[PDB]
Design a protein around this ligand. Sequence first.
Ligand SMILES: Nc1ncnc2c1ncn2[C@@H]1O[C@H](COP(=O)(O)OP(=O)(O)O)[C@@H](O)[C@H]1O
Ligand SMILES: N[C@@H]1[C@@H](O)[C@H](O)[C@@H](CO)O[C@H]1O
Ligand SMILES: [Cl-]
Ligand SMILES: [Cl-]
Ligand SMILES: [Mg+2]
Ligand SMILES: [Mg+2]
Lengths: 397, 420
Amino acid sequence: NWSELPALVLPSLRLDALLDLGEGHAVGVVRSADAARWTVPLVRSRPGDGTAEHLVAALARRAAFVLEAFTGERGIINESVIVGECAVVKWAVRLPAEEPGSPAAQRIAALARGGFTEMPRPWGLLTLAEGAQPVLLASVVAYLPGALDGWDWAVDDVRRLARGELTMDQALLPAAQLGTLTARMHAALAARGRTPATAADVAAWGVRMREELDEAVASVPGAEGERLKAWAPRIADVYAELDALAGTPLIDVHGDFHVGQILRADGRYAVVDFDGNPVLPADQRAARQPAALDVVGMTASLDHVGRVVVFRTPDVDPAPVRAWIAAAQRSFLDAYRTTLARLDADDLFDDRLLTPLRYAQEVREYLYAVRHLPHWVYVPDLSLTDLLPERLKDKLA
Amino acid sequence: MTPNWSELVAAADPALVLPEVAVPGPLRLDALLDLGEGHAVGVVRSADAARWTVPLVRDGAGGVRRSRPGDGTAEHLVAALARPDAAFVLEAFTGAAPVTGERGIIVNESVIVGECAVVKWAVRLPAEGEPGSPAAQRIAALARGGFTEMPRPWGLLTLAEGAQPVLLASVVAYLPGALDGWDWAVDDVRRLARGELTMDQALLPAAQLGTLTARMHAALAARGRTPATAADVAAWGVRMREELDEAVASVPGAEGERLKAWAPRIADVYAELDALAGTPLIDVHGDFHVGQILRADGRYAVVDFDGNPVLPADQRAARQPAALDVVGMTASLDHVGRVVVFRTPDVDPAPVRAWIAAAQRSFLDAYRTTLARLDADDLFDDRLLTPLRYAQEVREYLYAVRHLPHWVYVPDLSLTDLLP
Ligand SMILES: Nc1ncnc2c1ncn2[C@@H]1O[C@H](COP(=O)(O)OP(=O)(O)O)[C@@H](O)[C@H]1O
Ligand SMILES: N[C@@H]1[C@@H](O)[C@H](O)[C@@H](CO)O[C@H]1O
Ligand SMILES: [Cl-]
Ligand SMILES: [Cl-]
Ligand SMILES: [Mg+2]
Ligand SMILES: [Mg+2]
């Protein structure tokens, strides 16, 4: 059977639930010794075995599981496995406790119900409705062929700008269209309601952002760490102003908004990856957050695109790239605010959170670097170099 | 016994208002500033309702006549600054001194006083209550704002009427050894092309021009900002489409062929102006280009604040986007490079064409930096750069077909590098 039959839960133990897909394929919810639950495709199913294909077949042909549908495999990394070059099956590797799961089902459903179309077409949905909290197990959306994520087309656009193949207005147009897309996304997501942030909510932000700042200061080495340590008192002072921001509107957000989540194909843009920030606990990715968190996530990512272009491109002229960094963030912010005005949704964006959340986003770049990609410390170092002394001169005036 | 100024002016020959052409008589004296000792400044209206600023001097030969260089009327105006009808406003600025000695100069009637000051009589005036030259408003705002990159203003004589005071006379410092930008900027690029200057040395004036423009706009913005209405940006597109139509239907040769093919793409850029409603409008230079900048010994001075001549006389005082001056200067910097390549034998075009692109970046960077340093980023809307830049190059076509036909090469080469 499947119950009796360690690293199985990790891509490349007791059983809680099993959805037999037939022919040896199954979607299992495995609990670890540390009370950690996992969604393990069983055949572990690798891209090509057919488990992702059997999931689409089981969803297209219809009590502990829920297989919803809406009307060969090649994987690429949660784990996203393309099926038939037409649908993307995304598994949920890590599962919460027996509590809230991935909010991607509620995010996509609210966007589709609000008229938001700048996203891949949803196909199916697999949900574990057995415990006290229904946990999302798999999502199936339409596969956009020949599509590239932001870390590919935005880098290519800025590289063409540095080579003179594009004008500044041509290079800034994607940043402006991303601003209008983000406003339509927030306007559709805010339809589910708004929640004023309590004094305990803004206090939890300060302690969390100060804790991460202390971790980065104590982990970033060499000259980059010395510059960050000198900046840390200034950053900590900005974190203290969060206590006076209680009552700011909290809505359903993307949670992990950056250019890599924006796919471009045939001149059209689509948003993906509504599973929440992976660095956040599983019981917080579905919580309502400020819309400015997505705004600072995208504007910081646009800044980082320019840093990457200068870093990786031989013989690059950094002058138009660095000018693009400032102009792309303005083009994004201007189009985002004006689109919220045309949608009568100006109330969900609180620009007082720009500087504190932007600083916290760059600190996470330090933490991501020391944990996954050590040389990446140059990106938040260059971003804060152009951002911190400018914002400090205004506070001292 | 002695007749008043009104009686003398009415009995004077209509040519009194002229420094050949004929004015209809008789004349009528609307306002008179008594400068003492037989000198005066009159606001005279002819039989065709045309108003004039006339420097007047009483003369025992003909009763009254128009002041000439040497009569002492410009001296008396300057002396009146170094120190009162209700219709006149005399504002003096730091540096005015009662210098003596007059000499005529052509630069709308200018008189050199003391060989260190320039008195300029505004010969032709607008109608009563109608807008005119905003030069007095511009110069006074720059002086009160601490702007010094201009000829030191000594004083302004204005007529207290209308929404803005009507300029009657201006007194500024005389700069006998100063060239305009079409001399020194062309000379800088030529020296760059033949290796006498480095690229960094040839780009420094472009950055200094950006700082000057930002200081100028920040001072001019101190009088206030006006948000552009939807009808304003709609009228901009109408005026720019008409100028584009006039250019396409007039420019000949291969330049006209390229402009005709570019016209649909240019009109598409003009269509995005409707989304720019609310952009800030301030007092601007209005006719801003390198020819308006004097340079000597590392010092820069902007002149000519009466507005755009091709614009209607009652519209040159209206508030305009600060980006219009920016576009005017960046375009003129482009044209400086085009002129160097066109006129210099055996010139190396590569360093000049690199300077064209780099000078515009140096100008914008210094302009943005100085605006931020003065906390005046709000007045510059860079979304207007491309549509207004295309409109400036189209105006070069119109200036060419009307005054200098071969000049069509300048906007042709500029648009060739600006279009994608
Ligand atoms: N429907 C789709 N069609 C084409 N490409 C997609 C689709 N969904 C995701 N991708 C690509 O897969 C990559 C990662 O997917 P994502 O869901 O963001 O993974 P994760 O959330 O684990 O980072 C993205 O860069 C995106 O380009
Ligand atoms: N800040 C994180 C980093 O991990 C990186 O900049 C990017 C790619 O992982 O994703 C962002 O959410
Ligand atoms: Cl890198
Ligand atoms: Cl010429
Ligand atoms: Mg992702
Ligand atoms: Mg994700």
